[PDB]
Amino acid sequence: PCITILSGHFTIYARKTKELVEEYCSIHGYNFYYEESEPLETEEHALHFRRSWIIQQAAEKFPSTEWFLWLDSDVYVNPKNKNKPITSFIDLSDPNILYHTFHEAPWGSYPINTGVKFVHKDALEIEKIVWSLRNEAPWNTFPYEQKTVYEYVFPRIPGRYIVHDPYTLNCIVKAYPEHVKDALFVHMCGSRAERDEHM
Ligand SMILES: [Mn+2]
Numbered sequence: 578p579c580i581t582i583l584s585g586h587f588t589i590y591a592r593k594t595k596e597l598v599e600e601y602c603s604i605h606g607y608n609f610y611y612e613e614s615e616p617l618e619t620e621e622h623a624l625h626f627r628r629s630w631i632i633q634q635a636a637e638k639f640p641s642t643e644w645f646l647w648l649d650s651d652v653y654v655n656p657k658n659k660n661k662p663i664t665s666f667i668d669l670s671d672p673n674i675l676y677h678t679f680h681e682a683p684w685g686s687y688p689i690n691t692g693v694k695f696v697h698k699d700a701l702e703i704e705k706i707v708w709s710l711r712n713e714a715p716w717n718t719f720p721y722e723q724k725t726v727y728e729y730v731f732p733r734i735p736g737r738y739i740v741h742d743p744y745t746l747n748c749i750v751k752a753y754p755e756h757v758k759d760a761l762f763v764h765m766c767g768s769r770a771e772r773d774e775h776m
Contacts, residue, residue: 578643578669583635585612586650590772594653601654605662610635625721626711629704636701644669649692651765651772658761666745666761675700676738684752689740691723692764693747703730
């Protein structure tokens with residue numbers, strides 16, 4: 578399908594991850610949207626929610642998109658696998674599914690990690706609602722958009738989401754060091770100097 582990968586960051590590591598993702602899209606014919614812009618709302622919760630505003634900007638630019646893929650700015654493409662398409666790691670053929678998300682068990686603090694998040698075009702209005710909840714309790718409490726997707730969105734869409742193993746597509750470096758080599762998306766979740774050094 579038509580994939581648009583989107584990300585944003587307003588930083589060496591973040592430029593390097595950008596490059597790799599930008600390169601990866603170019604290799605496979607994916608659209609690339611990057612929010613280089615400065616956020617109007619700069620509080621901690623609002624910055625986490627900003628991904629749900631960015632997707633709306635991505636969709637305006639690329640309206641022919643079937644699947645939107647959010648990647649954090651601390652997620653990069655594993656050089657080893659840069660020549661492999663996304664479809665070689667995940668089945669996006671089920672027309673009923675709106676979200677593909679990934680767990681972080683047992684090292685992670687929450688049932689899903691939205692650092693890598695697949696959103697079907699038919700869920701764009703849902704992402705609009707997530708953005709709108711950014712200043713509403715309990716959604717404005719940590720972990721923010723990630724809590725809102727898991728606890729507000731998912732209950733309303735039974736059967737329309739899959740929570741996947743993270744080993745290839747949301748491979749947190751510190752948590753899964755034995756999986757990093759074979760991963761597609763590597764997530765430097767868990768420090769700028771540390772990230773630059775890694776990049
Ligand atoms: Mn992250």
